[PDB]
Amino acid sequence: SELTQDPAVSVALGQTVRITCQGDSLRGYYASWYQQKPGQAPVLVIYGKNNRPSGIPDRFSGSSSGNTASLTITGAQAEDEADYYCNSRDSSGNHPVVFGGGTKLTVLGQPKGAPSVTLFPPSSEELQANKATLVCLISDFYPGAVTVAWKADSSPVKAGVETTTPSKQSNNKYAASSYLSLTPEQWKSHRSYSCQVTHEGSTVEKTVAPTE
Amino acid sequence: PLQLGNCSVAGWILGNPECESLISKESWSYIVETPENGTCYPGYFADYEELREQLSSVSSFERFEIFPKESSWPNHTVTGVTASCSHNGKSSFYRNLLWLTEKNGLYPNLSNSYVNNKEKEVLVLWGVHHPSNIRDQRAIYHTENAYVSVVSSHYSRRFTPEIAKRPKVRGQEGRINYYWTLLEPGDTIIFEANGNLIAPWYAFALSRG
Amino acid sequence: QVQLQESGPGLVKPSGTLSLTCAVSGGSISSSNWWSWVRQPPGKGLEWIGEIYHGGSTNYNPSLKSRVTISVDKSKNQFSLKLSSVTAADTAVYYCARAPPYCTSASCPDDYYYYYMDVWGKGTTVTVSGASTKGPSVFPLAPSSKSTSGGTAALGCLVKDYFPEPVTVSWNSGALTSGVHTFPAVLQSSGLYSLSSVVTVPSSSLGTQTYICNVNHKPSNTKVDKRVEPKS
Ligand SMILES: *[C@@H]1O[C@H](CO)[C@@H](O)[C@H](O)[C@H]1NC(C)=O
């Protein structure tokens, strides 16, 4: 009844990859495929057996062999890093629609980029509201894995820290953000706060001062 | 002699995809034939043996277009293909007929006519599709009880689609009965239907038939 | 062509009734199309909910059949979804889509054995919580010299303490697109959200160009236009 597909597969840039979908309902109706990039709604890439909607590259192709549907991407490119879902209709009962688990396509070989760090001190308006938030923004780094650490003066700070997981930018690089919530007194009673971003062993550190 | 080869009279006249060549002669004295009855889509061919009598000797054969694929069918969807009719490895349909189905979820009343102004007898062919259940019927034509009417000066018949579970033949449990008539010079034939019509696309004009 | 627009509440109390609306434009609701609903729980995949025909035929997901009711209204050219006795497991992003007509038997052409959804709505986030709605506090992230890196400079907006998701940020009411990035929201300890929106800009412009970020929090019906000026 359910459609099953592997959760994750990886392909090198410019290579080809077959994403397989298997389920006992594929015999009754044809299988469709979607591409979903993070924070976006799914987009249909294949109607039926190798019929694509207007605006879908010829690199995407579909096929079927019994209860096995496949999606093939030729000349894989970094724009293709996303989730892929197969979809069909159940051939029995009242004919429910079932989705496959999804497949995370990682595209290997992309160029590596050091993290760019921008650290904003508390706004004067926020301070006058009796709160202080240090905003550390990290962008344009690949691979999208990063570890952030904060320093008050030169001592570590683990309390009041919140950080987001990396997310793809528009140029296929990753970006993240880190926050350190302070009281206006905690902020004025130190000489400097720092955001330390470690990516691929190398570390970039930005510093802001209350006195400035 | 008319060379059909791997094809039969039914396949050749309806435009069976495996009979794309061999329209051949404009006249002939006898027909050369020797395949699941020759009909891609299962059904019953009306007066097939009698049709073979008429076509075994003719002098001025011609395949023309009685209802162009466009314009002649402004409404209704005309791209219907099925796995049963396949050219090479892809789904297809008869070269001379069109499967009319949903257009924007509606099946408006059908009435189209053609006057034989070719100075010969005209052989028009059409079909009547019979779905296996009623839900599929409504999925295509949107009418629980449909009709097909073909009328001329010397022909008239109304068709009722009988919907019942049938054993799968050639992978298809639906049926299409095929029917033919001869239109005399100057005579006018009209097709009226609200569903289940395999519309004529290409007709034929001949003599001594 | 046909386009779908979702309408629904950002928040729904636990054990209450979720109700959304999908409007059809450029096409008629009374067509041979299956108007469908889909949802996506956080970090999970796609889950089909149900479908409806303009005539009234309904087919629901077996697991949700008991608490689901998809409707249609030809008066406004809309169709709707209703999910009752909601729990946190119902918190998800809900979509409306259009699916083609199909056939159960082998009487139809090949075009009626596809299944797909080609036109989708943009999605509406629905959170199931007993917490009350809170609007955002927008604070500027002003550009400075310890922030400008050459010709380009960075400025943004801090959107602090709001609930529930989502928040959408634009700049200059949509006239500033390039070099813009709005970061995923972070979930603080208090259960409130916060996110930032940054934009990259030439350093010579910030002296003579006005920069405004337009924050929108539809769950609270709040629209904040915040002027980001350089520090002085
Ligand atoms: C349908 O047929 C009518 C004639 O009966 C014609 O006027 C119309 O343009 C056709 N197409 C549509 C979309 O109505």
Query: Domain span at residue A133?
Result: 116-208
The rounded distance, in Å, linking the Cα atoms of A116 and A138 is 5
Q: Tell me which residue has its CA closest to atom 7 in ligand 1.
A: B74
Looking at the fold, whether A130 and A189 belong to one and the same domain comes out as yes
Resolution (A): 2.8
* Helix or strand (DSSP H, E) at B31: strand B31-32
The answer to whether the beta carbons of residues A138 and A197 sit under 8 Å apart is: yes
Domain boundary among C130, C152, C184: C130
CB atoms inside a 10 Å sphere around CB C62: 12
Burial class (CB in 10 A: 0-12, 13-18, 19+), A162: middle
DSSP bridge partners of C69 = C82
Looking at the fold, whether A37 and A92 belong to one and the same domain comes out as yes
Helix spans in chain B (H): 9-14, 48-55, 134-140
CB of B75 within 6 A of ligand 1: the answer is yes
DSSP state of B58: B
The amino acid sitting at C141 is L
CB atoms inside a 10 Å sphere around CB A74: 13
The answer to whether the beta carbons of residues A100 and A3 sit under 8 Å apart is: yes
Looking at the fold, whether A144 and A74 belong to one and the same domain comes out as no
Looking at the fold, whether C1 and C104 belong to one and the same domain comes out as yes
The rounded distance, in Å, linking the Cα atoms of B107 and B127 is 17
DSSP bridge partners of A11 = A107
Strands C11-12 and C124-128: parallel
B21: Cβ–Cβ under 8 A, 6 or more apart, which residues? none
Domain boundary among A108, A133, A152: A108
Looking at the fold, whether C102 and C19 belong to one and the same domain comes out as yes
CATH of domain B1-209: 3.90.209.20
The rounded distance, in Å, linking the Cα atoms of B150 and B122 is 14
DSSP labels for A89-130? E-SSTT--EEEB--EEEEEETPPPBPPEEEEEPPPHHHHHTT
Looking at the fold, whether A131 and A82 belong to one and the same domain comes out as no
DSSP state of C184: P
* Preceding omega of A96 cis (within 30 degrees of 0): no
Ligand 1 centre to CA of B104 (Å) is 12
Looking at the fold, whether A98 and A134 belong to one and the same domain comes out as no
Looking at the fold, whether A139 and A67 belong to one and the same domain comes out as no
CB of B71 within 6 A of ligand 1: the answer is no
Ligand 1 centre to CA of B110 (Å) is 11
Three-state DSSP class for residue A79: helix
DSSP bridge partners of B97 = B200
CB of B70 within 6 A of ligand 1: the answer is no
Q: Tell me which residue has its CA closest to atom 14 in ligand 1.
A: B75
**For chain A, counts of helices (H) and of strands (E):** 2, 19
Looking at the fold, whether C191 and C145 belong to one and the same domain comes out as yes
Domain boundary among A92, A108, A124: A108
The rounded distance, in Å, linking the Cα atoms of A59 and A57 is 5
CB of B156 within 6 A of ligand 1: the answer is no
**Geometric angle at alpha carbon C193, from C189 and C194, rounded to 5°:** 110
**Which residues in chain A have their CB less than 8 angstroms from residue C114's CB?**
29-30, 32, 47-48
Three-state DSSP class for residue B74: coil
Task: State both tokens at C42.
Answer: 């956080």
C205: Cβ–Cβ under 8 A, 6 or more apart, which residues? none
The rounded distance, in Å, linking the Cα atoms of C153 and C142 is 10
Looking at the fold, whether C43 and C113 belong to one and the same domain comes out as yes
The answer to whether the beta carbons of residues A135 and A144 sit under 8 Å apart is: no
Query: Domain span at residue C189?
Result: 131-232
The rounded distance, in Å, linking the Cα atoms of A46 and B91 is 18
**Is B104 in Cβ contact with C28 (below 8 Å)?**
yes
Nearest to B187 by CA among B115, B119, B118, B123: B115
For the sheet containing A155-157, what is the strand order? A155-157, A147-152, A193-199, A202-208
DSSP labels for C89-121? GG-EEEEEEEE----SSTTS-GGGS-----EE-
Neighbours of A, requiring at least 3 CB pairs below 8 Å, are: C
Q: Residue C136: which CATH number?
A: 2.60.40.10
Nearest to A48 by CA among C173, C158, C116, C204: C116
Task: State both tokens at B82.
Answer: 């099925």
The rounded distance, in Å, linking the Cα atoms of B100 and B72 is 12
Strands A103-108 and A8-12: parallel
The rounded distance, in Å, linking the Cα atoms of C25 and C11 is 26
Looking at the fold, whether A10 and A44 belong to one and the same domain comes out as yes
Strands B2-3 and B31-32: parallel
Mutate to test the interface with C, among B100, B136, B169 (most CBs of C within 10 A): B136
Three-state DSSP class for residue B163: coil
Range 74-103 of C in CB contact (< 8 A) with B:
101-103
Expt. technique:
X-ray
Looking at the fold, whether A154 and A92 belong to one and the same domain comes out as no
Looking at the fold, whether A55 and A126 belong to one and the same domain comes out as no
Three-state DSSP class for residue C117: coil
Instruction: Specify the number of domains making up chain A.
Output: 2
DSSP labels for B84-107? EEEETTEEE--SSEEE-B-BTTB-
The answer to whether the beta carbons of residues A60 and A72 sit under 8 Å apart is: yes
DSSP state of A1: -
CB atoms inside a 10 Å sphere around CB C45: 14
Looking at the fold, whether C141 and C126 belong to one and the same domain comes out as no
The rounded distance, in Å, linking the Cα atoms of C20 and C10 is 10
**Is B132 in Cβ contact with C105 (below 8 Å)?**
yes
SS (H, E, C) A126-182: HHHCCCEEEEEEEEEEECCCCEEEEEECCEEECCCEEECCCEECCCCCEEEEEEEEE
Task: State both tokens at C9.
Answer: 């509440």
Looking at the fold, whether C122 and C140 belong to one and the same domain comes out as no
The rounded distance, in Å, linking the Cα atoms of C55 and B135 is 13
Give the total residue count for chain A: 212
CB of B74 within 6 A of ligand 1: the answer is yes
